[PDB]
Assembly symmetry: D2
Homo-oligomer: 68 residues x 4
């Protein structure tokens, strides 16, 4: 009773990408297979990386979504 078979969709934060031409991003909390916060993203060239949710980095993303 806990999780069994652990597997986070994106390992570590994929901040290597910069926020700007992004398009949409998903944000999933820490499930069983993923006890760490797991948020993924999507760019203009329909591809997907992933970022964190405990810093001002993704806050610039959501803030960039509010500006419009």
């Amino acid at each position: 009773m806990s999780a069994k078979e652990l597997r986070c969709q994106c390992v570590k934060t994929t901040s290597q990408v910069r926020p700007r031409h992004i398009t949409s991003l998903e944000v999933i909390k820490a499930g069983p297979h993923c006890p760490t916060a797991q948020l993924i993203a999507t760019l203009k060239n329909g591809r997907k990386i992933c970022l964190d949710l405990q810093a001002p980095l993704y806050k610039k993303i959501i803030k960039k979504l509010l500006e419009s």
Copy 2:
């Protein structure tokens, strides 16, 4: 300024659902077919509705995700 009536994955805000047992939600900005901010979500029972991003309602969601 913007457009209207095209192909928004979710018409109007689906706030009829309350934030609590949710699981994850996507955040899409106003594209072409969707000049309105288009945010969709996902529940614990893998289903999906959609919320807004210009009020304190979704702020309770992201805030509920920061809690953990």
Copy 3:
């Protein structure tokens, strides 16, 4: 006794788009709010339309994914 307009993320089939530069597509069955088969898609320009799952149209999509 369960079949009527509820909340399908995509009403009617969005076949107006042609399969070619697509990137990825979701395949959801007919849930409660969606008694109709609900398949959504994504293009190379991170956007999303939707197609059917009972014709040779989406079979050209999956077949296009098998070719590679």
Copy 4:
């Protein structure tokens, strides 16, 4: 086919899960960061694993989606 050291979303096929109470699954082809076919999925308990697209395993999924 593969450049050098890329970033796939789901490593290896997550067939450890059996198809039955599933809810919906994504189908992404081999991008740049993912030269391998990258198909992800979703269960009834809004979670996400991933399967392959070159065997009869996912054919039981799509076939399970056609039956209804």
